[PDB]
Write a protein that binds this ligand. Sequence first.
Ligand SMILES: Cc1cc2nc3c(=O)[nH]c(=O)nc-3n(C[C@H](O)[C@H](O)[C@H](O)COP(=O)(O)OP(=O)(O)OC[C@H]3O[C@@H](n4cnc5c(N)ncnc54)[C@H](O)[C@@H]3O)c2cc1C
Ligand SMILES: Cc1cc2nc3c(=O)[nH]c(=O)nc-3n(C[C@H](O)[C@H](O)[C@H](O)COP(=O)(O)OP(=O)(O)OC[C@H]3O[C@@H](n4cnc5c(N)ncnc54)[C@H](O)[C@@H]3O)c2cc1C
Ligand code: NFU
Ligand code: NFU
Ligand code: SF4
Ligand code: SF4
Ligand code: SF4
Ligand code: SF4
Ligand code: SF4
Ligand code: SF4
Ligand code: SF4
Ligand code: SF4
Ligand SMILES: [Fe+3]
Ligand SMILES: [Fe+3]
Ligand SMILES: [Xe]
Ligand SMILES: [Xe]
Ligand SMILES: [Xe]
Ligand SMILES: [Xe]
Ligand SMILES: [Xe]
Ligand SMILES: [Xe]
Ligand SMILES: [Xe]
Ligand SMILES: [Xe]
Ligand SMILES: [Xe]
Ligand SMILES: [Xe]
Ligand SMILES: [Xe]
Ligand SMILES: [Xe]
Ligand SMILES: [Xe]
Ligand SMILES: [Xe]
Lengths: 253, 253, 291, 291, 437, 145
Amino acid sequence: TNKIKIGHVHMSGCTGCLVSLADNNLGLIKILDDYADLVYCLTLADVRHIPEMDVALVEGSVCLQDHESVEDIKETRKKSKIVVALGSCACYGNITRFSRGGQHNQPQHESYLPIGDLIDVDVYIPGCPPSPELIRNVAVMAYLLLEGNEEQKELAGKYLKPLMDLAKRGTSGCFCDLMYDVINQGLCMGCGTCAASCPVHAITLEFGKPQGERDLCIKCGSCYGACPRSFFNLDVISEFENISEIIAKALKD
Amino acid sequence: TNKIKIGHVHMSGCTGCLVSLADNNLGLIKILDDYADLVYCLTLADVRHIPEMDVALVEGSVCLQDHESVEDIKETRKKSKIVVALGSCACYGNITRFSRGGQHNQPQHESYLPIGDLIDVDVYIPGCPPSPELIRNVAVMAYLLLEGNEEQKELAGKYLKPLMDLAKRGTSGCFCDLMYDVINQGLCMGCGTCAASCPVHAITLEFGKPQGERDLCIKCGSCYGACPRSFFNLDVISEFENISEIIAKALKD
Amino acid sequence: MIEDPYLGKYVTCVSARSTDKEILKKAQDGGIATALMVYALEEGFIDGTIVAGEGDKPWQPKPVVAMTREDILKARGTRYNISPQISWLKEATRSFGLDKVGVTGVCCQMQAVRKAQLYPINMRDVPGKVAFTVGLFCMENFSYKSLQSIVEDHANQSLGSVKKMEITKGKFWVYTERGNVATVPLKATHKYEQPGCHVCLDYVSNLADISTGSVGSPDGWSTVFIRTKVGNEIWSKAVADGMFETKPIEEVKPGLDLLRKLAKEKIDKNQKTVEERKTFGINKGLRNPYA
Amino acid sequence: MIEDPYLGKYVTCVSARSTDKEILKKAQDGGIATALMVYALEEGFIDGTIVAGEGDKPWQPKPVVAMTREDILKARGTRYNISPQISWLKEATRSFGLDKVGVTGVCCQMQAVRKAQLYPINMRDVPGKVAFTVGLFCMENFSYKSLQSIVEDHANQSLGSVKKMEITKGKFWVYTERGNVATVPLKATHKYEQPGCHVCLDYVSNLADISTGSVGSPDGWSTVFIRTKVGNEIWSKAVADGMFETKPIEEVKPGLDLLRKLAKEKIDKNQKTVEERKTFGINKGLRNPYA
Amino acid sequence: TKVVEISPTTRLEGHSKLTLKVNDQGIVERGDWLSITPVRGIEKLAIGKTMEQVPKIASRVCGICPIAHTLASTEAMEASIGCEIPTDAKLLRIILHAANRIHSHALHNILILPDFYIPGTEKKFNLFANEQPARSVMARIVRIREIAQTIAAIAGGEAIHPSNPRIGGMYHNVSPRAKQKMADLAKECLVLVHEQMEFMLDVIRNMQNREFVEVGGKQIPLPKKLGYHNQGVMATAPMYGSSSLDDNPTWDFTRWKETRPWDWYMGEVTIDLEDPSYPIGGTTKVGTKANPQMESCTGVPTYDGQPVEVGPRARLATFKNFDEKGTFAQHIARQMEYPDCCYTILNCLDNLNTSGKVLADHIPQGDGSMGWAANEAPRGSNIHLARVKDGKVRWYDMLVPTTWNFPTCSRALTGAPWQIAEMVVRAYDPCVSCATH
Amino acid sequence: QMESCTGVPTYDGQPVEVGPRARLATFKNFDEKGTFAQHIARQMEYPDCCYTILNCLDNLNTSGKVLADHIPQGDGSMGWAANEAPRGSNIHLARVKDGKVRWYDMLVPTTWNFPTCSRALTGAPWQIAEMVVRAYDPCVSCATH
Ligand SMILES: Cc1cc2nc3c(=O)[nH]c(=O)nc-3n(C[C@H](O)[C@H](O)[C@H](O)COP(=O)(O)OP(=O)(O)OC[C@H]3O[C@@H](n4cnc5c(N)ncnc54)[C@H](O)[C@@H]3O)c2cc1C
Ligand SMILES: Cc1cc2nc3c(=O)[nH]c(=O)nc-3n(C[C@H](O)[C@H](O)[C@H](O)COP(=O)(O)OP(=O)(O)OC[C@H]3O[C@@H](n4cnc5c(N)ncnc54)[C@H](O)[C@@H]3O)c2cc1C
Ligand code: NFU
Ligand code: NFU
Ligand code: SF4
Ligand code: SF4
Ligand code: SF4
Ligand code: SF4
Ligand code: SF4
Ligand code: SF4
Ligand code: SF4
Ligand code: SF4
Ligand SMILES: [Fe+3]
Ligand SMILES: [Fe+3]
Ligand SMILES: [Xe]
Ligand SMILES: [Xe]
Ligand SMILES: [Xe]
Ligand SMILES: [Xe]
Ligand SMILES: [Xe]
Ligand SMILES: [Xe]
Ligand SMILES: [Xe]
Ligand SMILES: [Xe]
Ligand SMILES: [Xe]
Ligand SMILES: [Xe]
Ligand SMILES: [Xe]
Ligand SMILES: [Xe]
Ligand SMILES: [Xe]
Ligand SMILES: [Xe]
């Protein structure tokens, strides 16, 4: 079979999403060797314009007052079969929610939206920083979804489903997700997972229940993501040993 | 014509929404005299059970683990032509977003949702506290929508439209509304109105742009409401002198 | 009651200037906004008014509840950056204890006031205590860093030396206290406009009780629209009391024809901008507060 | 590889208890959870493990990363209120510098670990450094104020006097250090359960490497399920090394038949609860994390 | 004079472009390298936020060097409020800081080698390719970065956007095992970075001995004084940094003034030279208009009224009187910083007391006084300035290393074949998201 | 015992009545008890409210300072405050450390009155049990909080 064609599109991001991918180490080189061609990535290669892509890893959000930027993200949807919001800036805005303009030398650069507000997004990879393991897993599963037998494209399509459901749920991420859609919903069980995943130590548990420092939270959506009562697809997660073995196989030398 | 039949349904609220209504003073007595019967209100009258209502002013939110409470709010939809979420607890959760259980003598009373999450809501009256003027205006316009000539039911139906659009937009209120749907959208013009309406002084303007103390904000939705770049229905608001004259007429002695 | 589709609904329109010479010494134009609030205070139509007072950096405006003639005059002159006038609208009726609040500002600020009067959202007591609005014409506004960049880089002037600023006749004008003048072509300034001004469809402050501006009248003179019953009672009384020199707008150059043309360009340009938000994306668009 | 639909997927199931007498002195049951982590530490399968250690109020558990035999034993005994075990899952791989993390907890906590391994959302380094999970059976949990109300009002005991607590045979059992015993009917306690336990469809910790509990075995003895390859390598080695007394579950009363029945009641009861959330409202329902 | 424009740049972080005026031979006469990254405005959004939040937001300026913004921002708050952090918190911050310099320099090796030749040949390095020696070189780099990111996560809580720093010190000290593990990793890393350092120095020495390089088919001559400028250098420490809490700060805020691109960049021009063959997609179409004064997205900080170079050569010139300048000098200086990083880590681990305190007993809330902190980030002096009052940021300013290097690199472009203008740029290890913030 | 949504605060081990009669008995030795006594005591509090307001306005300096120059962040010590709310003693207790609330407790007037009113119900026709209740001016949202 053919390797899929993968591009890295960089909007208003910090390149930490790209770095996370590279922090797969030899796993990334195994992927690039056997399953994917990087057709585009301004940081690593000299391809000046957005080619056609099977999978586009888009990082960062969109500044509505930068013409070239609105064009790049429209062009990316046009040129790509699967669009991935890579990281919390692309999924949910993250720190660019806080942008409000007035700084040199473009005081009018004021308004920033996550990509799903301008184009349709197929898969979310939430996190700030996003976990290398997730980016790898999503890349391998995208390859099975496109060049595997029917048994794999079925596995791969079930794995990716909650990440696709997140892209259809909305473009907002915040500590309050855990209130709205978990505690307020009767679903919280006090496991503490949200506290472990928060990257700015904004979450403590008081008497088994989440307490959010909302003026510390940078609005990344990680905690609802990781919460085992947001999505819990029993068909995938109960096969953890098997799916882990498959993934390790796909990277073995 | 007949007076419309109005009820006050009290969920998990503080009765401050009711107090606001009463703070219309003689205007409320004018309304009760000439245009509406209060068929239900546990605070003011002895009617023990929820009768049928033309308009139901529902205050407070719904505790999912109190059986009687889930029943009352379903019963209210069944018994009412127009359902009004009166105040921010009913519209958006407000301080009950923060509830998480563990207090005597019902440690399991844990989860609270705004009413629109359990039943369909026709009109929002946001605020904490909600402004008496708005509750009055909405009550007079509801009467015109039901017992007036076609010229009034047209006026009244256009006035109420943004309050109906808010009920369909969602059940979440927060300072971040001004980021998501105004600043992030290119719409903020720095008028400062949000700062005036915030009831806990959570909002300052820094260089003409909103700055939110998110650990002060009690999640009431007032600031997006009052913002002149959330909804601005030019057909009503440009007729301010006329609509003001009509409203004053309806209460004159 | 005319009903221009670019000048809003109004009773009459004349070209005026205050007869109070001390007020005219630093007024931007004819001194209409200052003279109307001073007179409203002395007569008792208002007991206080929000104005753009002096702030903490040079040429940065700071809203304030003025309650004396002297505090009102402190707000003379146009400041070309944002002054969040409405932030004190509710507080005026609380700690300040006012019964009859005045408000001054540009067109969007008048709209906020009218919205608060009809849809008060946590704005208790405001609808019935707004007593007088005076609205300025406004083509667009800037942030402070924008005004800094225009004045200091493009005009090459020190802000601590500037006595007056004026947009007119296609140029940004800076006047120094020692007597020099500098200009900037308006094409250079277009990157510096506040993005939220690009969806504004109101030029002569349609929703004010009285409206006032510069275009249409000679230097030192204001183009004034009287619009509401409140605007009419106060303006009549003030002319009767000698507060104003008038001249019908028809017998003044450039007059109401130039004004209608600049209003028309603003709405059509911005209306286009409003239309494109709808299809800004691919299968997705941006919000429209007007839908 | 059996595949019970109420007991999950597992290789074998025996009734066991640790041969380490010092560990058995305060173990809740057979001392399986303690003995498996101690042995995993001494053998090198883990270099540390999250356990429910002693906290700051009596009978309040506090999660902690244990890295010595002595710290592990401090977590013996069942605490009937929430211990957010996973809050330290990532920190174990950072400041603590662990390569091979153990985790202990109830069924929902095992699910969090497995979810983090497959969908790490800001959980970098966790998937490949989780090395051993031991899961307890769990019918339901309580908040601290619930456990306070049960013990002090219903059992009428002082928390500072309680040496052990046990839910079994339809009653909540309290044992004091001076020797008394008190019970509460489980019907009385139903208002005090954590509401989020009512949608839980997992009784014997299906997703653990090894699972262990009380039901099915005599007092002082544990019902144990070996499930994953990791669970198998470690359990085999430990029996070989003499760490355990075993007995096939079939030749033990009440044995695997009682267990399957209580598991079945939990899932069916909770599954009904999950189903009703769908129509909880009028034309509206509540979220289902399982959809 | 003609006008050629490369947009976007590649093999650097972020979004910039080169707008070059060239003579009749295609040599730069005056080039402008400018940012076209949209301005997120961190310094303005900071105002009114808590002093705890602002460093965690500023970290998200850049994911290659988040350590630099977390530390410079946190220590600007500590300096404004007068907070002295415990010794064991300082030691963990230095370990975090040196680990991150190792990973950043190694990443930059990946970005610059495609322009370099396998010594003595005419084959350029291709690292992607499963051929030697490229592949065993990529393996060394991958393990260096991995060691570096692991040490960073241990001492810093997270390798990208460290969680452990806080006003007053750190959230956590590390366990005895963590300390052993960082020591073990830094022993392995010291061997590797010595190998990599020697490897890169030989490749650069071979480049200094070439007369031309090949760019999209053509031979491009390699000038002797490639990338020379007369701006001088500015550096605050050979390793860590300096703050206004110090008895003798090594940065003088009285010598700094930030202006707008206005004073140093070119005005409007029109592109009258184009090359569709430039790898890979050609240059800007003829007839396009460009205005670096108005398209540049950064401000121009100056020292004694002039732009300056910052970064690894800035540091070695300031502290050891390193006396070579230009493109290849910059590459050399950067590689020479490899071993110090690992010696520092090991010295710091040796003095660290894992039982010691990491949080100052008292954190004052601030009275509005100005403080500043300089972090010597992988690319140069990173200076944050702050006024904190009642725990809130009332004034904030960031002078980031690539911001300093933009006007200085631009001037360094004179005398270069426009086809290797990008090579002059890459010697600065540019981070355009940083520079713009 | 199980449907009641409040806790039962006690003083010297017993429930107590709070509110306007509680105040007049404590401070003036007001010596009538029960439903109509409670109504009387409450009305007698009308004039003090307006005399207080006027005395306070008279001493108020509108140019004076309203914010303490220094706000300490707290070391975890317990403090409490009692407000004589319209229905009785409202006592909040707190431990604040580093500007955060580490422990909080609220003893609200209608919470105090619940068990005390219950006992007051003895000897009444069940049809006027509600009249006995209304003399306490109950606020059940307060009592439950
Ligand atoms: C951004 C801005 C843009 C404008 N654009 C135009 C235009 O395009 N065409 C035209 O004819 N006129 C425009 N004007 C109005 C004009 O410049 C004069 O200010 C107006 O005629 C009032 O002059 P005056 O002599 O009556 O007022 P004065 O007696 O000089 O009193 C000044 C009034 O201006 C208010 N004010 C000053 N600065 C601000 C500010 N940033 N925000 C809110 N209120 C402020 C003050 O409250 C005060 O009442 C603009 C004003 C502003 C602030
Ligand atoms: C709410 C709860 C409900 C339970 N319900 C049942 C049941 O219905 N039927 C049944 O057979 N068994 C149940 N168990 C398990 C049983 O009570 C024993 O705890 C189990 O068999 C372990 O005993 P042991 O002798 O091997 O462990 P020990 O050697 O005594 O070690 C104790 C283990 O329990 C962990 N632990 C203790 N309290 C908690 C807590 N709140 N949260 C997370 N981890 C904790 C500790 O980390 C430790 O590893 C429950 C346990 C808990 C916490
Ligand atoms: N080194 C570095 Fe950053 Ni990505 C830059 N420039 C900043 O501090
Ligand atoms: N008075 C009164 Fe409240 Ni509505 C009561 N009880 C509280 O403090
Ligand atoms: S999600 Fe975080 S790591 Fe990714 S671009 Fe945004 S700031 Fe950087
Ligand atoms: S991760 Fe989810 S279920 Fe677990 S404590 Fe946090 S909100 Fe509650
Ligand atoms: S609380 Fe922490 S994990 Fe959740 S959205 Fe805020 S920053 Fe992200
Ligand atoms: S919205 Fe505010 S006033 Fe209305 S019930 Fe809720 S807390 Fe009370
Ligand atoms: S009210 Fe709306 S438009 Fe006015 S300053 Fe606030 S968010 Fe901006
Ligand atoms: S900021 Fe203030 S007005 Fe807006 S949602 Fe929060 S509490 Fe309400
Ligand atoms: S152009 Fe319109 S929105 Fe912008 S300041 Fe002027 S009145 Fe306000
Ligand atoms: S019943 Fe289920 S959700 Fe509740 S504690 Fe036990 S394992 Fe967790
Ligand atoms: Fe800066
Ligand atoms: Fe209480
Ligand atoms: Xe990278
Ligand atoms: Xe890479
Ligand atoms: Xe890839
Ligand atoms: Xe890539
Ligand atoms: Xe997909
Ligand atoms: Xe990848
Ligand atoms: Xe994918
Ligand atoms: Xe009321
Ligand atoms: Xe009332
Ligand atoms: Xe009413
Ligand atoms: Xe009412
Ligand atoms: Xe309606
Ligand atoms: Xe009303
Ligand atoms: Xe209505």
